[PDB]
Amino acid sequence: LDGLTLSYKVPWPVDIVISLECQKIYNQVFLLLLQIKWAKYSLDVLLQIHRMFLLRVKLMHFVNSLHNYIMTRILHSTGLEFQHQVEEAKDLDQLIKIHYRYLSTIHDRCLLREKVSFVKEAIMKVLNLALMFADGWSIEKMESDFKNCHMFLVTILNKAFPHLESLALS
Amino acid sequence: REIITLQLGQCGNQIGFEFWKQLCAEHGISPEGIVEEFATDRKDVFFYQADDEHYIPRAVLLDLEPRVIHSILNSPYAKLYNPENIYLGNNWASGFSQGEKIHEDIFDIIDREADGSDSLEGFVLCHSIAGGTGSGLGSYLLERLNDRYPKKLVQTYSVFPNQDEDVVVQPYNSLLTLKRLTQNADCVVVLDNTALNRIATDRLHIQNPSFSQINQLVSTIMSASTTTLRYPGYMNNDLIGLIASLIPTPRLHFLMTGYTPLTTDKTTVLDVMRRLLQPKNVMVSTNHCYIAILNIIQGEVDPTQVHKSLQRIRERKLANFIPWGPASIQVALSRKSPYLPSAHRVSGLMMANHTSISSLFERTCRQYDKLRKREAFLEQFRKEDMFKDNFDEMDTSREIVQQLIDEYHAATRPDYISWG
Amino acid sequence: REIITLQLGQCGNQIGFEFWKQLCAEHGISPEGIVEEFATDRKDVFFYQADDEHYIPRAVLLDLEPRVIHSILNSPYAKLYNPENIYLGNNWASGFSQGEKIHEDIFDIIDREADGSDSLEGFVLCHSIAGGTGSGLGSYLLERLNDRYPKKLVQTYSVFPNQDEDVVVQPYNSLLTLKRLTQNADCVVVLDNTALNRIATDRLHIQNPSFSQINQLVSTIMSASTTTLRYPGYMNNDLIGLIASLIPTPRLHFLMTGYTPLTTDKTTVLDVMRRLLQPKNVMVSTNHCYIAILNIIQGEVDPTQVHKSLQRIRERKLANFIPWGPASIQVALSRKSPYLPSAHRVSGLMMANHTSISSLFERTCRQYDKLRKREAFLEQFRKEDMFKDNFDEMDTSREIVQQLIDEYHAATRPDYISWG
Amino acid sequence: SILKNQEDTFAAELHRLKQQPLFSLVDFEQVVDRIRSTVAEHLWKLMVEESDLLGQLKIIKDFYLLGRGELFQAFIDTAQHMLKTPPTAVTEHDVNVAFQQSAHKVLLDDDNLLPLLHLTSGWAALGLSYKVQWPLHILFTPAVLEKYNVVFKYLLSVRRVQAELQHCWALQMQRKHLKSNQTDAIKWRLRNHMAFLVDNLQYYLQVDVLESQFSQLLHQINSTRDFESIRLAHDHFLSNLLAQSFILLKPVFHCLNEILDLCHSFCSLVSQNLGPLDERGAAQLSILVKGFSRQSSLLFKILS
């Protein structure tokens, strides 16, 4: 869930176009993705006792709903926009400009700058539930965490950046 | 990953042939196995790679007292695969007893491709309920693969035999096979022969050539079931990623079907979404409410009107879900399939859990109770007497499926936090 | 808002069919339910939206001993709606007793579309007085919807049976049904079969094919009644906005009709206004004075000659209204209907309260008194004896409608500030 | 365009005036006017056709001078939190959320999402902001949308009251229906119809008023084909609308305000009333009937 630096070798005529910090940004958004892949596959590997059924349904859903927002509405929307942008780029300067104006919006929508100690920490604490539910195979002490942190998340989500209503249905 | 597909019975081999022929149509390949040189996508989802631009499909065909298998045999679609796996009463006990003795050699044929397969995800059963030879044999083989493989997934495409009426041992066969289906299968895809007959009489006015057009609708649903895997998507590119949201508990694992045209002789994604909600467009026929739904769209992509439609199907309020849970109908978008001409460029598919099929199950249960009390409809052969002298296994099967009906009706309630 | 229309009886189902067919003609839709792709206006005033450009009309049809319903059934206008709501003596007690037992399943059919309807405004009854099976059944069902729905409005399109003469229980049936009409209905639209016969013999020289041409005139009035709702106006785009001015008190709730051509085989709005004042152009036949009038015009718009005409109908002095009140004839202007060819591009409609119909009521009352004293015309069946052994309910009904006549004549006076 | 085409001709005129030894204002004026005609018709030629002025004015009337009634009745019905004091921290965004959600149920679900609600108790609030094609419309100005907005408030007020009157006639629905009770605490003189007259007739008056002015404006713009001419029409059309709707504060406007407040209170009593009886409602009722008669008399103080 942490570490993993992977590089790629780019030729010089395009390595003088694409920045080094751009590679660092790709790494950051990769890390964010890996946490979602982790929680989803971690709730995908599992196959009184039937209370874990409720604890499966109430959580597997919620993580998949988070997945549907973050992946599609940001990472595929803006990428399909980005191709349509670069096919209309007609200058050496403006291609770098529209490229950097793509990074600074996808790095915003998925929050990787500004107020990562007020919003992100809720996403941080709910993955530990995927750890705990993976361990068991006590049980109410995960739901006691879940309801409190969930209401903590929702009572933060109630404030409008105006695009934060696009997830406020959960 | 890779999935070995498993067909037995007359009807089940017909859909196996029809699906593999349709996948030959979908991919840029010849019916002889040769990949086309005018061809991006994956053609290795279920195919062993030989050299001569040959992706040999990984399918094992099984037969018992073969009639239609000979007509399947003489075909140009028999040169795509057939790694020489052909191997030879209409009761459940007939198929069960005849599978009993020969289980080892067909399982050796299984193990052949099992070590042949470097990668594996699951086994798909092409089954037919109350097909005679398919019944009993398929449930026995299902028990054997489950016993041998606790690491693999099993999904079964099976018919629900109801054509509004003669075979009188049919509820007995369906009862036993459904007992094996509930406790020895990981995934069930059910359809109504009555509902497909209804939609066939909708789109045309046929009554006799129903089988071939039923093959058309089932091939569309089976191809739509696999489009996210055969073409590179992003999620549910595995069986298990598709399956996991749909089953909240393995007593609720029976899955519903959908295809958005009625007649297959700009509309937004909202419209096919909202009418894939309608039960006249669902190909399977108190208040019943859905436990989880997943919908799949392949076609024209409106990049923002997805979430706009999502807010719309919310505030439409056509489908209220399970009370005791966060149950959503969920959206998947895939590429529309190249390499073939296509009418209805937008096409939709629903997988859901609904409580409505417990009615069909109690229908079969009540018919079984009637025929069992009336006592002329077990048809008293040597197969059934050697299998069970006292015939209590059917009674146990009815008990278990009645328990399952009770579980269904208790899940139907707003309170299913307590057991039962 | 949305209104579910309710038809029963032979004649009432004929007008339900005729009105819905005429609305199919008025909107840009096919008779099969398909909306036209060469089409601004609303096509959702009474229509459930399916997908295939299908606005399914929201109408419930009811039958008892069906004859004409079979001829309604075999039609290309039976593919527009029919959500499968067909469900099966010429006395009032016959319809009343036969509706008594089966009220729950037809009300379940009602509740089906009631939860199906997200929005609701009212229920429209297509009724026929002294139609035999329609009588009794309609009044019973009227009592049931009123008992179940104190939050909804009811308007009834009903015939007044008078054709200058054989049925001798007719004033009994009309008396009982009018008792239910006064105290269990919110809105009454009455017409004279004699007056429509007169205008039919005016425009042509027919005597035998009167029914079809009567259907023409009634469809014109029924379409004109709904033009302000089906096409976007500004006021009386609801039933209640139209209704509220017309009823000053719910003993005076019986509404009059008008259509400005006599023969339908520049004229200013004043002219149709001033002759919609005339009783030869009113389709329903001391001094009687109007209690409130509302007029509705659809056609050519002169933007200032409206108020000029208003001053003109003032100083014409053809109609002096109720003394004890501020009673005006009031003007409504609407769009002339597109999507159909139209003769008489200017067309008018009056809704009013007049005291003239109390004459028709005392006519029926006097005929009832004559037949009741003469004592051979109740026709003494088991229906009437099981319904009432002593037959005092008809006497109570006559008492109440006589009280209503007294209320009518007291409202006719310049003093109706005191009760009675 | 064609100004650039005949640019040298127009410079040739000014050059010609330079060459002459005698200058007159009279000739110079004709040059100015002859240029003014062509330059003014070019702008008109674009704004009516490519900026679709004629179709847009219909829309502006519909939603703004309230030419559609269905949206703006049910919105007031579904906004009952304007009966409270607003905090103006939550309500402002909330009304736009409610408005778009309301429109999605039926009738203009997805077309023209450009307009936005505004807040200007809550019923004295609720404005409207509308965005147009700013480079392709310069006749539309901040002042125009304002003079517009005052009319929008008043035409809201009349629709607001008539809904109250028809809703308070639940007497027909549930109280004189299976029921008859008695009188002298059930009859209140039945003044409810007479006050309904005094708003309903203002409604028809306004209907004549709006429809006549909208017709003359659309008749005018066809004939006037210079843009400078168009502005006079629009400034005449608005100024007519103000006085004929009686918006301008006159004694009659004071009378109308008094009528609105008295009627609002009269609705507010019988709404909360319940199953009917004198609950100390009669003292209010006596003050109401006296005040209505007295205020009605002032409308007959200007008759000659």
Side-chain angles (χ1 to χ4, degrees):
Chain A
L1 74 168
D2 59 0
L4 198 143
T5 300
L6 181 65
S7 174
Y8 175 58
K9 169 77 194 310
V10 171
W12 184 85
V14 275
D15 205 10
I16 62 181
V17 183
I18 302 302
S19 89
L20 280 296
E21 188 177 359
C22 288
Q23 325 302 117
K24 313 178 186 187
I25 298 310
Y26 298 157
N27 301 359
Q28 290 323 110
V29 303
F30 213 79
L31 202 58
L32 288 211
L33 160 62
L34 302 191
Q35 292 156 26
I36 312 292
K37 291 311 295 163
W38 192 282
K40 296 178 310 260
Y41 195 61
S42 174
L43 301 172
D44 201 17
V45 288
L46 311 99
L47 300 100
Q48 302 298 125
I49 298 106
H50 53 272
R51 183 177 158 84
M52 325 327 142
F53 295 154
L54 296 171
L55 269 298
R56 178 198 188 175
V57 190
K58 219 153 182 282
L59 277 64
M60 162 178 69
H61 159 86
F62 158 82
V63 173
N64 297 4
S65 62
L66 181 69
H67 182 58
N68 297 1
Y69 183 52
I70 299 178
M71 301 326 137
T72 74
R73 193 78 162 88
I74 300 161
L75 318 184
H76 188 55
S77 308
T78 61
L80 194 64
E81 300 331 287
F82 193 36
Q83 49 91 13
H84 176 67
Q85 295 325 297
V86 294
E87 64 186 61
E88 308 172 292
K90 307 286 162 194
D91 195 14
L92 170 79
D93 198 8
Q94 81 174 99
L95 58 91
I96 299 170
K97 289 202 288 193
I98 192 68
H99 193 270
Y100 180 67
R101 292 280 94 70
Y102 164 79
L103 310 162
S104 49
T105 184
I106 65 178
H107 200 84
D108 287 30
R109 288 192 172 174
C110 305
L111 210 66
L112 299 106
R113 35 188 279 190
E114 190 159 343
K115 282 184 289 188
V116 293
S117 49
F118 302 99
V119 188
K120 296 331 270 185
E121 40 173 359
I123 299 175
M124 293 288 160
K125 58 204 301 179
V126 294
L127 75 95
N128 312 347
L129 303 160
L131 307 177
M132 296 177 96
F133 194 60
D135 290 358
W137 193 231
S138 57
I139 59 186
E140 47 174 7
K141 310 189 176 182
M142 273 72 85
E143 192 62 68
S144 63
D145 192 30
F146 186 32
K147 299 302 290 175
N148 181 263
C149 64
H150 177 84
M151 295 324 170
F152 278 4
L153 183 41
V154 168
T155 55
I156 293 171
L157 185 52
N158 302 155
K159 186 56 170 62
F161 176 67
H163 185 265
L164 286 164
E165 47 83 25
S166 193
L167 68 154
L169 299 88
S170 300
Chain B
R1 263 155 69 171
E2 304 295 320
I3 289 169
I4 307 297
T5 76
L6 273 158
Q7 40 186 90
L8 62 115
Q10 326 280 326
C11 315
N13 290 310
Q14 285 160 250
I15 349 279
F17 172 82
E18 160 85 14
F19 172 86
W20 282 113
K21 180 181 62 63
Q22 233 65 278
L23 258 68
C24 175
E26 281 155 55
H27 296 278
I29 93 184
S30 90
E32 286 61 23
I34 293 107
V35 127
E36 300 320 287
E37 217 33 61
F38 54 91
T40 39
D41 64 295
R42 187 195 188 181
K43 301 160 185 167
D44 200 82
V45 257
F46 306 98
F47 312 98
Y48 174 68
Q49 160 74 2
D51 175 36
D52 290 18
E53 278 76 20
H54 269 86
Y55 281 104
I56 295 183
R58 307 205 237 175
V60 188
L61 133 124
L62 263 79
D63 51 288
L64 200 72
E65 309 198 284
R67 207 272 285 157
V68 72
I69 295 102
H70 318 300
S71 16
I72 298 296
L73 243 153
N74 52 353
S75 55
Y77 304 104
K79 313 176 293 186
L80 240 149
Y81 58 113
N82 191 2
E84 286 311 286
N85 50 12
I86 303 115
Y87 189 46
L88 278 75
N90 294 117
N91 309 84
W92 190 95
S94 80
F96 195 76
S97 44
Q98 289 192 295
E100 217 110 40
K101 44 173 171 52
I102 63 175
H103 64 300
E104 290 297 322
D105 69 6
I106 41 184
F107 186 63
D108 274 320
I109 297 164
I110 292 167
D111 295 331
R112 184 186 79 190
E113 309 288 347
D115 330 328
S117 48
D118 199 359
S119 238
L120 215 54
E121 176 63 39
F123 295 101
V124 157
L125 193 64
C126 315
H127 202 204
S128 115
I129 306 310
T133 80
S135 51
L137 172 68
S139 45
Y140 178 71
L141 249 327
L142 208 102
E143 287 156 336
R144 306 282 66 70
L145 33 99
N146 202 314
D147 286 345
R148 288 296 286 115
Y149 303 104
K151 312 299 186 312
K152 284 323 173 177
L153 245 126
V154 38
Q155 170 174 276
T156 289
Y157 288 98
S158 68
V159 300
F160 195 65
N162 171 39
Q163 296 285 48
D164 301 297
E165 299 313 287
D166 188 54
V167 155
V168 301
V169 74
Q170 168 179 0
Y172 305 81
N173 305 325
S174 348
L175 192 89
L176 297 174
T177 315
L178 248 308
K179 174 193 186 164
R180 274 77 197 175
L181 243 85
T182 51
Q183 68 183 318
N184 311 100
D186 294 351
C187 287
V188 189
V189 188
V190 346
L191 26 71
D192 237 4
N193 299 132
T194 266
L196 300 192
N197 189 19
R198 280 178 198 171
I199 299 154
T201 42
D202 201 24
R203 61 210 342 246
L204 256 83
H205 197 32
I206 57 163
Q207 290 193 341
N208 330 282
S210 36
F211 312 100
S212 67
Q213 310 292 334
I214 264 179
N215 297 141
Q216 308 317 300
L217 276 139
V218 180
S219 19
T220 56
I221 304 168
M222 285 270 293
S223 61
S225 67
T226 56
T227 315
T228 173
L229 302 103
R230 302 176 282 99
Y231 295 111
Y234 183 50
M235 199 45 231
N236 307 355
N237 297 5
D238 46 344
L239 174 62
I240 180 57
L242 184 144
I243 285 312
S245 2
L246 275 280
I247 298 166
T249 177
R251 298 102 311 290
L252 309 160
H253 55 102
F254 293 79
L255 306 181
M256 317 294 189
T257 77
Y259 178 57
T260 52
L262 339 160
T263 321
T264 316
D265 311 348
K266 183 61 180 174
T267 1
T268 185
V269 333
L270 168 79
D271 272 306
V272 275
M273 263 160 135
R274 180 170 94 232
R275 239 94 351 144
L276 191 78
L277 285 169
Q278 287 209 108
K280 307 181 181 186
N281 315 68
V282 170
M283 348 292 318
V284 187
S285 289
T286 193
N287 166 267
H288 285 306
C289 356
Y290 286 86
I291 300 108
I293 309 178
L294 168 66
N295 73 98
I296 282 98
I297 189 65
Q298 47 272 6
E300 311 277 71
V301 178
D302 200 315
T304 189
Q305 259 189 359
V306 275
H307 92 91
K308 306 263 191 221
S309 171
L310 260 51
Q311 274 147 283
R312 209 147 169 331
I313 319 143
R314 209 269 272 251
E315 294 277 298
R316 161 64 199 94
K317 265 296 172 180
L318 180 53
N320 5 12
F321 283 72
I322 198 70
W324 45 280
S328 151
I329 175 176
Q330 304 195 350
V331 49
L333 166 61
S334 88
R335 347 182 132 174
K336 171 81 174 190
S337 170
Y339 298 142
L340 81 168
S342 252
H344 308 126
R345 297 277 164 197
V346 218
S347 182
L349 169 68
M350 52 145 313
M351 224 48 40
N353 229 292
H354 208 186
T355 39
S356 62
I357 66 186
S358 136
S359 61
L360 279 302
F361 301 148
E362 60 67 22
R363 277 177 77 253
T364 48
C365 241
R366 154 207 53 90
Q367 282 160 251
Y368 163 71
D369 293 345
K370 176 186 44 182
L371 300 184
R372 173 69 169 159
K373 289 194 301 305
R374 277 191 73 212
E375 262 190 57
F377 312 96
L378 181 72
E379 294 167 322
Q380 200 40 260
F381 290 144
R382 314 301 313 122
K383 355 242 202 297
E384 281 86 358
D385 191 25
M386 289 290 181
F387 173 59
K388 200 51 169 48
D389 318 329
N390 281 354
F391 303 93
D392 316 325
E393 291 175 294
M394 308 181 302
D395 277 321
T396 306
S397 73
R398 192 222 64 95
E399 168 172 346
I400 296 307
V401 300
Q402 180 53 66
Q403 200 200 359
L404 255 297
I405 290 299
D406 298 314
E407 285 141 39
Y408 291 164
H409 288 327
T412 310
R413 309 299 109 187
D415 285 301
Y416 194 69
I417 301 176
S418 85
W419 51 278
Chain C
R1 263 155 69 171
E2 304 295 320
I3 290 169
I4 308 297
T5 76
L6 273 158
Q7 40 186 90
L8 62 115
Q10 326 280 326
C11 315
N13 290 310
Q14 285 160 250
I15 349 279
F17 172 82
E18 160 85 15
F19 172 86
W20 282 113
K21 180 181 62 63
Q22 233 65 278
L23 258 68
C24 175
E26 281 155 55
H27 296 278
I29 93 184
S30 90
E32 286 61 23
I34 293 107
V35 127
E36 300 320 288
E37 217 33 61
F38 54 91
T40 39
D41 63 295
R42 187 195 188 181
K43 301 160 185 167
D44 200 82
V45 257
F46 306 98
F47 312 98
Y48 174 68
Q49 160 74 2
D51 175 36
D52 290 18
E53 278 76 20
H54 269 86
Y55 281 103
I56 295 183
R58 307 205 237 175
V60 188
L61 133 124
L62 262 79
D63 51 288
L64 200 72
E65 309 198 284
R67 207 272 285 157
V68 72
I69 295 102
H70 318 300
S71 16
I72 298 296
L73 243 153
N74 52 353
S75 55
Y77 304 104
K79 313 176 293 186
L80 240 149
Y81 58 113
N82 191 2
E84 286 311 285
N85 50 12
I86 303 115
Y87 189 46
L88 278 75
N90 294 117
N91 309 84
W92 190 95
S94 80
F96 195 76
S97 43
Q98 289 192 295
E100 217 110 40
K101 44 173 171 52
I102 63 175
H103 64 300
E104 290 297 322
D105 69 6
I106 41 184
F107 186 63
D108 274 320
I109 297 164
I110 292 166
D111 295 331
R112 184 186 79 190
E113 309 288 347
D115 330 328
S117 48
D118 199 359
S119 238
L120 215 54
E121 176 63 39
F123 295 101
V124 157
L125 193 64
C126 315
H127 202 204
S128 115
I129 305 310
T133 80
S135 51
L137 172 68
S139 45
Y140 178 71
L141 249 327
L142 208 102
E143 287 156 336
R144 306 282 66 71
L145 33 99
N146 202 314
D147 286 345
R148 288 296 286 115
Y149 303 104
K151 312 299 186 312
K152 284 323 173 177
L153 245 126
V154 38
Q155 170 175 276
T156 289
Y157 288 99
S158 68
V159 300
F160 195 65
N162 171 39
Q163 296 285 48
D164 301 297
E165 299 313 287
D166 188 54
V167 155
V168 301
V169 74
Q170 168 179 0
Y172 305 81
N173 306 325
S174 348
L175 192 89
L176 297 174
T177 315
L178 248 307
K179 174 193 186 164
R180 274 77 197 175
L181 243 85
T182 51
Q183 68 183 318
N184 311 100
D186 294 351
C187 287
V188 189
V189 188
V190 346
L191 26 71
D192 237 4
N193 299 132
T194 266
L196 300 192
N197 189 19
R198 280 178 198 171
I199 299 154
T201 42
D202 201 24
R203 61 209 342 246
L204 256 83
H205 197 32
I206 57 164
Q207 290 193 341
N208 330 282
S210 36
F211 312 100
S212 67
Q213 310 292 334
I214 264 179
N215 297 141
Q216 308 317 300
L217 276 139
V218 180
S219 19
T220 57
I221 303 168
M222 285 270 293
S223 61
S225 67
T226 56
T227 315
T228 173
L229 302 103
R230 302 176 282 99
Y231 295 111
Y234 183 50
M235 199 45 231
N236 307 355
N237 297 5
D238 46 344
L239 174 63
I240 180 57
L242 184 144
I243 285 312
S245 2
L246 275 280
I247 298 166
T249 177
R251 298 102 311 290
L252 309 160
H253 55 102
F254 293 79
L255 306 181
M256 317 294 189
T257 77
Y259 178 57
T260 52
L262 339 160
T263 321
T264 316
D265 311 348
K266 183 61 180 174
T267 1
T268 184
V269 333
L270 168 79
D271 272 306
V272 275
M273 263 160 135
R274 180 169 94 232
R275 239 94 351 144
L276 191 78
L277 285 169
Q278 287 209 108
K280 307 181 181 186
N281 315 68
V282 170
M283 348 292 318
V284 187
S285 289
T286 193
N287 166 266
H288 285 306
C289 356
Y290 286 86
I291 300 108
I293 309 178
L294 168 66
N295 73 98
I296 282 98
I297 189 65
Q298 47 272 6
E300 311 277 71
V301 178
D302 200 315
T304 189
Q305 259 189 359
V306 275
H307 92 91
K308 306 263 191 221
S309 171
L310 260 51
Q311 274 147 283
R312 209 147 169 331
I313 319 143
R314 208 269 272 251
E315 294 277 298
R316 161 64 199 94
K317 265 296 172 180
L318 180 52
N320 5 12
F321 283 72
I322 198 70
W324 45 280
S328 151
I329 174 176
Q330 304 195 350
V331 49
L333 166 61
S334 88
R335 346 182 132 174
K336 171 81 174 190
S337 170
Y339 298 142
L340 81 168
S342 252
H344 308 126
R345 297 277 164 197
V346 217
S347 182
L349 169 68
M350 52 145 313
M351 224 48 40
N353 229 292
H354 208 186
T355 39
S356 62
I357 66 186
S358 136
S359 61
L360 279 303
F361 301 148
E362 60 67 21
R363 277 177 77 253
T364 48
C365 241
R366 154 207 53 90
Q367 282 160 251
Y368 163 71
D369 293 345
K370 176 186 44 182
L371 300 184
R372 173 69 169 159
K373 289 194 301 305
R374 277 191 73 212
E375 262 190 57
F377 312 96
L378 181 72
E379 294 167 322
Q380 200 40 259
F381 290 144
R382 314 301 313 122
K383 355 242 202 297
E384 281 86 358
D385 191 25
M386 289 290 181
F387 173 59
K388 200 51 169 47
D389 318 329
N390 281 354
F391 303 93
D392 315 325
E393 291 175 294
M394 308 182 302
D395 278 321
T396 306
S397 73
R398 192 222 64 95
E399 168 172 346
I400 296 307
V401 300
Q402 180 53 66
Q403 200 200 359
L404 255 297
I405 290 299
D406 298 314
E407 285 141 39
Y408 291 164
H409 288 327
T412 310
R413 309 299 109 187
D415 285 301
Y416 194 69
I417 301 176
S418 85
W419 51 278
Chain D
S1 68
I2 300 174
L3 64 105
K4 302 298 184 195
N5 185 20
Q6 322 176 106
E7 259 184 314
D8 49 357
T9 302
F10 300 143
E13 305 306 283
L14 274 171
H15 183 62
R16 162 183 58 88
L17 268 310
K18 181 277 306 179
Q19 289 156 285
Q20 301 180 244
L22 297 159
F23 178 59
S24 176
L25 275 299
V26 173
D27 53 56
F28 178 46
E29 288 144 32
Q30 272 197 347
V31 194
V32 182
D33 292 319
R34 104 181 58 186
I35 299 171
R36 174 159 74 84
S37 307
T38 60
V39 64
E41 55 82 19
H42 285 144
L43 321 178
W44 170 93
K45 183 155 67 176
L46 308 152
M47 304 324 130
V48 307
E49 300 176 56
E50 59 85 32
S51 195
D52 201 269
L53 199 41
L54 73 170
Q56 183 206 355
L57 262 292
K58 162 76 157 46
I59 297 168
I60 294 166
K61 189 275 297 173
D62 286 347
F63 306 124
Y64 202 90
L65 320 180
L66 294 199
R68 194 141 293 209
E70 297 71 78
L71 299 171
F72 299 99
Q73 51 92 14
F75 185 70
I76 302 298
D77 307 348
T78 197
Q80 298 296 320
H81 299 80
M82 275 159 59
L83 198 52
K84 328 178 180 175
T85 49
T88 61
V90 181
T91 57
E92 283 190 359
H93 57 80
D94 180 48
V95 302
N96 191 15
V97 178
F99 178 67
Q100 58 179 313
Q101 284 163 354
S102 68
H104 302 334
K105 275 102 181 164
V106 68
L107 292 205
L108 310 174
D109 294 11
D110 200 77
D111 37 17
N112 192 21
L113 275 300
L114 320 175
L116 317 162
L117 281 193
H118 193 26
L119 174 143
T120 56
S121 55
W123 315 105
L126 183 47
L128 205 50
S129 57
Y130 182 44
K131 314 325 289 160
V132 302
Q133 282 74 236
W134 316 111
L136 306 168
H137 292 305
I138 63 170
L139 74 171
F140 301 143
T141 56
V144 161
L145 63 85
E146 192 276 337
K147 317 137 188 149
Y148 275 182
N149 184 27
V150 190
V151 184
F152 165 80
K153 304 144 198 169
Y154 170 79
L155 195 38
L156 200 157
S157 307
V158 286
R159 196 92 194 200
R160 192 194 312 118
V161 307
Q162 65 177 4
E164 291 189 82
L165 291 118
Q166 54 94 4
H167 189 82
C168 291
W169 204 49
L171 181 143
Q172 49 142 351
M173 309 200 278
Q174 313 175 6
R175 312 182 190 196
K176 205 134 189 200
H177 221 287
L178 195 42
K179 264 124 266 143
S180 102
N181 331 298
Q182 271 90 37
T183 191
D184 314 335
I186 309 301
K187 171 196 65 169
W188 64 97
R189 201 195 158 161
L190 313 182
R191 189 172 42 83
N192 171 237
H193 312 305
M194 293 100 91
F196 186 64
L197 188 76
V198 83
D199 62 282
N200 195 25
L201 296 200
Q202 306 169 133
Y203 208 65
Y204 299 121
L205 189 151
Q206 292 301 110
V207 160
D208 190 348
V209 153
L210 61 91
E211 194 53 68
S212 42
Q213 283 308 304
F214 177 90
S215 48
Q216 52 83 13
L217 183 65
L218 71 88
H219 191 41
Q220 184 268 356
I221 57 168
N222 308 139
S223 42
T224 41
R225 301 193 170 184
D226 294 350
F227 177 71
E228 206 177 272
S229 79
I230 295 298
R231 308 189 290 102
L232 179 144
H234 290 41
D235 298 343
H236 185 69
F237 153 78
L238 298 167
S239 52
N240 278 10
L241 282 170
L242 309 164
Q244 64 203 22
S245 45
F246 321 122
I247 300 309
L248 304 188
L249 302 101
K250 296 189 293 293
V252 309
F253 187 60
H254 295 90
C255 305
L256 297 171
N257 296 356
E258 280 180 282
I259 296 311
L260 307 162
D261 303 329
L262 174 145
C263 291
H264 182 67
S265 313
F266 165 65
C267 303
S268 183
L269 313 185
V270 298
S271 54
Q272 300 166 112
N273 174 226
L274 271 183
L277 176 51
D278 188 13
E279 292 146 38
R280 215 170 48 243
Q284 203 49 254
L285 177 57
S286 45
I287 300 303
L288 294 204
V289 296
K290 277 162 179 175
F292 187 20
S293 304
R294 277 181 288 154
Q295 291 151 217
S296 167
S297 306
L298 294 152
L299 187 138
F300 319 124
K301 198 59 179 188
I302 298 98
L303 60 84
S304 305

